[PDB]
Amino acid sequence: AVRLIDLENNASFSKSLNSTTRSHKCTLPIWAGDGEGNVSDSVTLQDVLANDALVEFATDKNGCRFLQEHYPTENDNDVHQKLFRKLVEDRAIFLSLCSNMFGNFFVQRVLECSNTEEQEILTEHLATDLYNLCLDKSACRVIQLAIQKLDVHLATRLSLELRDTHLVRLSIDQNGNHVIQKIVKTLPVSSWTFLVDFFADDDNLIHVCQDKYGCRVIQSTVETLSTDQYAQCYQHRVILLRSLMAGVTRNCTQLASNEFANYVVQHVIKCGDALAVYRDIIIEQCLLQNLLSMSQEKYASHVVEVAFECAPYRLVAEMMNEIFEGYIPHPDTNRDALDILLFHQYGNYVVQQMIQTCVLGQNARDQKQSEMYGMWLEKIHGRVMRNAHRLERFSSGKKIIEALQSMSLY
Template sequence: MDRDTFSDSRRARHFGRSNQNSLSFNNFARSENHRRNLRDTYLSETSSSEYYNTSFSPMNTRNSPAIPSYFDESSTDLSHQLNGFHLDDYNRKMLGTSASSLADSNYLRSNRLSSLPSWALDENREIRCDLTLRKVVEEGLVLSFSMDKSGCHFLQSNYFGENTQNVDPYIRDRVSREVLGSKEVFLTICKNIFGNFFLQRVIEYSTPLEQETIKKYIVSDITALCLDKSACRVVQTALEKLEPRFADAIVAAIPRKNRLMSICTDQNANHVIQKIIKKMPLKKWEFLVIYLCKQEHDNLLDICQDKYGCRVVQTIVEVLSEEAINKIEAEEKTRALRRLMSKILAKCAKLASNEFANYVIQHIIETPGILSDYRNAIIETCLLRNLLSMSQEKYASHVIERAFVYAPLSHIIEMMEEIFDGYVPHPETGKDALDILMFHQFGNYVVQRMLQICVDAVTGQRDTHINGIDFRHKFENWLAKLYVRARREKSRLNRFSSGKKILDILQSMEGYVPTATSFDLHSPFPQVDDVLAAFCPSSLFSPSATTTSNDWTSRTTSISSEPHFDYDFNFNNYQKF
């Protein structure tokens, strides 16, 4: 997969960077431990660890207790009935990722035998085709069916969807009382791997009176539900389907202090926060912006540097940059965005160099409209005068590339001038910034991007006018310098796929200068003036034959880089080889 496709993939945005350097890995480990500590603190305070099985160890090989037959239907003890499902044993089995698939299959089979009565199953241990919803309800099996895979499908196919209007009111009332009659039952179904899907349908087709009960149950244990893999889906559905007054009450119950950090950075709860941001008015979740922008804390930095938290911040930026419906909303969004962006600009250097936070900066740079001014501010305050060092960083180099692609022409010219003419060559080796980046494992992608921009400008695919002044001659000069440098280092470039890419782009350009001097790959490297003469006039180039930006090679190739040196700003002796 090429680099652009990889960067644009949402899944890869968070899981694709496998080759981390030790510093980034240590920072991530500290962030993970911090989030787990916050989560464990909450669980110890609320005494709800049974929902998360915090005492369970994946290495625990203790034999599971024998699973008794289905609970006594005549018993009225709800806790005894719930124990009949062996939910803790089931959750432990699902969490034991090292267990074999055969063991999991056997466990699920035995779990079905214990949760569903034998008369409801056929000879293949599947639900009988002649079983009716009335029979399930009258036998009091709604709870057990909802937490079985096939049973959950049976309930949804017979009670919801196209069949919803045809359900007997008596049956519907009985199902509602079974599910919503007790908070303990409701929370248990919420956290079940199958039951949560059935409960989402219950919420979708609930009445206002039932919604009041649903809201009360969710608010009573909101943090635990948000952190749970299954229950977080129920909370998101409630935010979408409940009446606004009930959804507002759920949002109001979200913790505002220390626990908010664990929610924003949790792999499950972050989806609840994103749902709130996308579906609710700004004034309902403005507390998130306030939390991120606290002066005495680095909440923004901590959340942006998290694998899941960076998506929360990016979602906030996306929503705040969308067009407002009315003037009042526009003013509120502008105010909140200005507050958030001032904090991001203050931490821009750290964010751009982080494994996950760099995506927040990339998003700001590549989004047009209201974020354009903030993109320019990032380039001016963070990137310019730091291009050489940031281009050699694994994650910051992605930000530099995005800046070259989406920056206005005036900023592109400044960035080009800094790379080509902004650093004094090393006094002993004579190497300049271009020498270093061309053979650097990350910097070479920046050089490829610069080369493609020059090609696009020279061939007319990119506008080169500012206030009526044409700057195409600058791009022709930079392209000529790249041409000369590539010919000089041809043997070294041919060793690497990235170097071959540079040579291929330049070779494709040579084919479209029929009247100019032709430079064979084996000929002595030409002077800059000769190359300029060959490249002019620009109209001789054909845009159709140039390489597109989608042809970039992947960063997986390891390239041995040259020793790095510190350079003084104010390079003024470029042609000293």
């Protein structure tokens, strides 16, 4: 008929009535409760809204599980809208419930049941303190389900909120690593080019690669930048990769002999498409005068193993000539690099890999290559036969013996 404008009744003191709980540990307000910390069967989401107790159920285990279980899936339901409004009315209570050990799961349930309009409010809330939210053990999950579920421009706004932050500290963090990995394995590369610019620095790249957590995010970025198929047709990723692989190839020696950055070095040796050039460089720069020394290291011997696995003949041949005739025999013991790596706790593996590639390559098309692999393998056989009495007693020596009976020199 006529206009009717309906202000909301205030409940200032009535919001404080939910502060009283049966338990010290439990946070469910006493009106909803068995007395055993479970929600009553008489409680309705409508009651939660009526009592203004969304935060208080989201802080409980059983109250939050109730919310997740009965939150409606369709975006046009009235209870869905009233609960979402109550969630996002206050930014501070939203970001507290994101940071809550139990409320995060409800924020994720909202993310699961979201449309584009709701995603806008959620993205603006997360953006205001994204860096600290993703540093938190609880919210980091919410941030990752955001990067999963959002529209790509909303997720890109979130990703770009990290543009000028302490990204070494976030990359090596036990929680933010998974966030950064999730971004680089999820969003298109334009959403996170600022990361690749960040690791154009040598020091940032070293401190992230020399970590159990940051080495895996560096692998995820490199594996994302390498996997294309639009060769020649433009080259944005190529330029990005290059600027990253520059440092890898410039600190290779250090990174390759590191507890964690070795995995990065072997990841670029294993991927033989866009990283092949870099694989070859890495071999040429840190490996190809240092094979004995690196095969005796507990970390670098794995890198030498995957280098023998994945190198091209041209380099495999220089590696083989290094081990067979590249070092001057010890002045006391009169033994070469091959003698040393046969009776080494780590080198043995390198020698086993040498055997493996010289048997796979014996079946190569180029006869010359087949002959060269055969005579390398023959040189290994002669040295193993002259040391077989001592090597037979070792597990590794037994693996070596049964590798060389399972060939055909032809």
